[PDB]
Amino acid sequence: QLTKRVKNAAANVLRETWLIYKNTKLVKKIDHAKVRKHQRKFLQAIHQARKLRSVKMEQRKLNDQANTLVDLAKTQLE
Amino acid sequence: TQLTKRVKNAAANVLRETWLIYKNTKLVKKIDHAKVRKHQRKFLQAIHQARKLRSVKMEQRKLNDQANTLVDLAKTQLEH
Amino acid sequence: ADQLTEEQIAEFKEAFSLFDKDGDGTITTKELGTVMRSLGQNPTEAELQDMINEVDADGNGTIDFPEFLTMMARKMKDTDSEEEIREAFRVFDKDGNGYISAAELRHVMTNLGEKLTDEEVDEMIREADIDGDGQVNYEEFVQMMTA
Amino acid sequence: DQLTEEQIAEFKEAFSLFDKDGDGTITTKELGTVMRSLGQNPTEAELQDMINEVDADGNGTIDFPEFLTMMARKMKDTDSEEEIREAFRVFDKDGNGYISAAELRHVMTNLGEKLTDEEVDEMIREADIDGDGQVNYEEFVQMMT
Ligand SMILES: NC(=O)Nc1ccccc1
Ligand SMILES: NC(=O)Nc1ccccc1
Ligand SMILES: NC(=O)Nc1ccccc1
Ligand SMILES: NC(=O)Nc1ccccc1
Ligand SMILES: [Ca+2]
Ligand SMILES: [Ca+2]
Ligand SMILES: [Ca+2]
Ligand SMILES: [Ca+2]
Ligand SMILES: [Ca+2]
Ligand SMILES: [Ca+2]
Ligand SMILES: [Ca+2]
Ligand SMILES: [Ca+2]
């Protein structure tokens, strides 16, 4: 799930990147309001990607830490 | 492509039953035959399934290209 | 686009006649066979029937104009979305080699005026990078753009 | 899927390895002491997260039932994970971390199964996420689960 959210955020980054490009480079008259809208969406997605990746990274650390504790408990199993 | 997922799913069953056959045949003291027979049976079914779905997938690929040929022909009438 | 224009509908009405060889208002499996062979292919009877069946919404065994039109509307809609994604791919894939590199993705951003770290551009690549080769090919790109 | 009476009694003994002051609960400070004694130095936030993951009733500390329930789930997951590792080690006959088509063909032959070499190759390809033509551990895990 966390992985999904990460890839989904990065996908929005990519989709909005394209939409900004198209509306900026591939039109005769630039629709500035449309460009501002996608730019806002771009920034929201990038903030989200950054946020989710950070959580993922802290999660990997925590997993090894928790497994250390789990292994300690398992030392008592016969 | 739900089909492709079903294909991968069927191959996954083949692999799982292969392991369960190995385990129950090579990695036990006394072989439990009813259980070996069970995994052999599910192995066969999964194989039958993987073959069926792969066949469907291959034919769908051919059909996609044939149909797209028809679609492209219809599209010749679109102006610009 | 979601819906066909009046003009496209009229054009597809003309297109229908290309398949309806005998002008009876329906396309049959025999007619699809004639059409395919005229295009240099030789589908089996079962393949021709499959092509009829996937369009024959009312199940009466032949394709009428509204059935053909409905299918064509769906195809035009799909083609438009797939074509936009290809257009995007070609732009990101600056050198046309089939792989979007981290460098190429940077250039896109930078030309848009965006401010991403080189590390951040790298992370985006790795997230779309299914086969682990460090680059984004067309299929990986399509998955990302449609997710 | 459940702990035996013996395992429960052993985890009750394990609880005391964490409950440094013997008050019947494990606190964030106690996990700090445990982790440091094992050679690691988690931040306060990390220790808090490790408590929170287990603290079902949300009172800030871990009691024996909460600890035990978590351990039950970990033992369940460990067992399934260890089964899949065992399968992998067997299929990856040369231990190089990749199940080759040849390795899988041999497994089938040795089980007396009758798959065409093409069918075995097709299975390798259905499991082969990174396209290198062989199945690594992570690719195998995704298949078996
Ligand atoms: N006493 C002891 O050796 N504890 C331990 C060792 C390795 C991993 C986790 C815990
Ligand atoms: N008339 C004609 O050229 N038809 C055609 C050509 C290529 C692809 C599909 C259809
Ligand atoms: N399956 C399918 O696409 N049939 C078809 C396509 C175009 C025109 C007439 C029939
Ligand atoms: N998160 C987490 O696993 N905490 C924990 C684990 C084992 C023993 C005590 C606490
Ligand atoms: Ca006709
Ligand atoms: Ca019909
Ligand atoms: Ca390139
Ligand atoms: Ca790639
Ligand atoms: Ca305590
Ligand atoms: Ca508690
Ligand atoms: Ca190997
Ligand atoms: Ca591989």
Side-chain angles (χ1 to χ4, degrees):
Chain A
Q1 195 62 26
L2 182 278
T3 46
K4 296 173 189 169
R5 302 180 68 200
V6 169
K7 203 185 175 188
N8 181 81
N12 275 319
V13 169
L14 273 170
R15 292 185 185 102
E16 294 306 335
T17 295
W18 164 241
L19 293 169
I20 291 171
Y21 182 92
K22 180 178 65 175
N23 281 104
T24 271
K25 306 289 299 170
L26 310 175
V27 301
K28 300 184 179 181
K29 297 185 183 180
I30 295 188
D31 182 339
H32 295 282
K34 189 172 296 300
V35 174
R36 280 195 316 277
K37 173 184 182 177
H38 295 297
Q39 179 62 15
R40 170 167 202 251
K41 292 179 184 294
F42 175 95
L43 295 172
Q44 291 172 326
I46 228 105
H47 167 73
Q48 257 281 306
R50 280 161 178 169
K51 174 181 180 178
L52 298 176
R53 181 174 179 280
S54 287
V55 168
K56 184 172 76 72
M57 302 282 77
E58 185 64 8
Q59 216 62 25
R60 263 131 161 83
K61 297 182 180 176
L62 284 161
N63 180 71
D64 287 332
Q65 286 172 342
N67 287 337
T68 302
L69 298 173
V70 175
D71 277 359
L72 179 57
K74 290 164 70 177
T75 64
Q76 302 304 288
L77 303 178
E78 231 200 324
Chain B
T1 51
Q2 181 209 30
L3 187 55
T4 58
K5 139 255 184 169
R6 255 184 291 160
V7 166
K8 200 188 173 184
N9 180 30
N13 291 340
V14 172
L15 267 186
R16 287 202 270 262
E17 299 301 340
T18 299
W19 160 244
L20 293 175
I21 296 172
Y22 185 94
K23 184 175 73 169
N24 283 278
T25 285
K26 259 82 162 51
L27 304 182
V28 297
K29 303 184 177 185
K30 294 171 184 173
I31 299 190
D32 178 347
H33 302 295
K35 263 194 159 300
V36 169
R37 277 193 304 271
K38 187 177 181 176
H39 300 300
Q40 176 58 20
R41 179 173 32 245
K42 296 203 178 176
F43 172 91
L44 287 192
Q45 294 180 334
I47 285 289
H48 171 75
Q49 190 61 11
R51 291 171 177 154
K52 215 158 190 168
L53 296 166
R54 165 140 203 291
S55 183
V56 170
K57 180 182 175 181
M58 297 304 299
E59 186 60 15
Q60 286 293 137
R61 283 184 179 177
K62 280 161 50 64
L63 288 164
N64 284 328
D65 290 338
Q66 293 171 333
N68 287 337
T69 303
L70 297 171
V71 174
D72 275 6
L73 178 61
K75 286 181 183 172
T76 60
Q77 298 309 106
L78 295 175
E79 288 157 17
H80 276 264
Chain C
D2 297 344
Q3 297 87 40
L4 294 177
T5 67
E6 185 164 324
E7 177 179 359
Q8 287 171 322
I9 294 174
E11 287 162 348
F12 281 139
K13 197 162 189 190
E14 300 183 66
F16 184 83
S17 298
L18 295 172
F19 305 82
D20 176 24
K21 313 298 296 178
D22 66 3
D24 81 338
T26 66
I27 303 165
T28 64
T29 69
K30 285 198 176 188
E31 292 176 321
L32 287 194
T34 298
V35 170
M36 291 296 278
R37 290 191 291 280
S38 79
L39 298 173
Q41 296 181 53
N42 188 34
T44 62
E45 259 302 307
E47 281 157 359
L48 296 167
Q49 187 64 235
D50 284 341
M51 292 200 288
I52 292 290
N53 296 351
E54 71 189 28
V55 186
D56 177 26
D58 70 9
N60 77 343
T62 62
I63 300 173
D64 69 16
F65 179 61
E67 288 170 330
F68 173 82
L69 183 62
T70 303
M71 175 275 294
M72 285 306 300
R74 174 174 65 255
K75 301 292 197 187
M76 293 299 287
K77 176 182 174 178
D78 295 337
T79 304
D80 290 348
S81 55
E82 88 196 33
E83 284 284 286
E84 181 155 356
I85 288 164
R86 286 181 180 135
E87 277 163 352
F89 182 72
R90 300 179 188 143
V91 173
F92 285 104
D93 175 26
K94 184 183 180 60
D95 65 357
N97 83 332
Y99 301 98
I100 304 169
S101 69
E104 293 175 320
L105 178 60
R106 267 203 330 261
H107 179 57
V108 172
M109 295 302 174
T110 300
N111 278 22
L112 288 181
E114 308 299 0
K115 271 78 173 181
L116 309 191
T117 59
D118 281 17
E119 177 56 24
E120 193 159 357
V121 171
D122 281 345
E123 297 169 2
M124 289 184 52
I125 290 290
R126 290 205 296 287
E127 285 151 352
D129 183 23
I130 299 175
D131 62 24
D133 73 337
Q135 311 189 267
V136 188
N137 69 17
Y138 175 70
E139 298 296 349
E140 292 169 336
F141 187 75
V142 164
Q143 302 205 4
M144 202 71 166
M145 289 290 275
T146 60
Chain D
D1 295 330
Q2 297 85 43
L3 294 179
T4 70
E5 184 174 2
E6 183 179 343
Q7 287 172 328
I8 293 175
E10 292 160 342
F11 286 133
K12 195 162 191 192
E13 280 193 306
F15 184 82
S16 296
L17 293 172
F18 302 87
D19 181 17
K20 309 305 283 180
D21 71 357
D23 80 342
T25 71
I26 302 162
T27 60
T28 308
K29 286 177 179 180
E30 285 169 329
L31 294 188
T33 296
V34 175
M35 291 297 283
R36 284 187 300 275
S37 76
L38 298 174
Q40 295 182 52
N41 188 38
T43 61
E44 178 55 26
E46 282 162 356
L47 296 172
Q48 189 60 57
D49 293 332
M50 289 200 289
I51 289 296
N52 295 351
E53 290 180 0
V54 185
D55 179 27
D57 74 3
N59 73 346
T61 61
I62 299 172
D63 66 20
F64 177 60
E66 285 170 331
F67 174 78
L68 181 65
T69 304
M70 176 277 292
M71 286 304 304
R73 174 179 57 87
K74 299 294 195 191
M75 295 296 293
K76 184 187 180 186
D77 296 340
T78 301
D79 293 348
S80 309
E81 182 180 38
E82 295 188 344
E83 255 285 272
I84 290 173
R85 273 174 185 136
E86 293 190 21
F88 185 74
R89 300 175 187 149
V90 167
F91 294 151
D92 174 23
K93 186 162 176 288
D94 65 5
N96 80 339
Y98 302 90
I99 302 166
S100 71
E103 279 168 337
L104 185 55
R105 296 193 293 262
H106 273 71
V107 166
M108 295 304 178
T109 291
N110 293 342
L111 287 184
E113 302 297 353
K114 298 199 169 190
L115 301 200
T116 65
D117 284 5
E118 279 285 26
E119 282 157 342
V120 172
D121 308 340
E122 293 168 353
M123 289 175 190
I124 295 289
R125 297 201 297 277
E126 285 141 11
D128 186 18
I129 297 164
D130 61 21
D132 73 340
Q134 307 186 351
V135 188
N136 67 19
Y137 179 67
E138 299 189 13
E139 291 168 338
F140 187 77
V141 171
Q142 300 195 217
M143 279 283 287
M144 297 295 285
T145 61

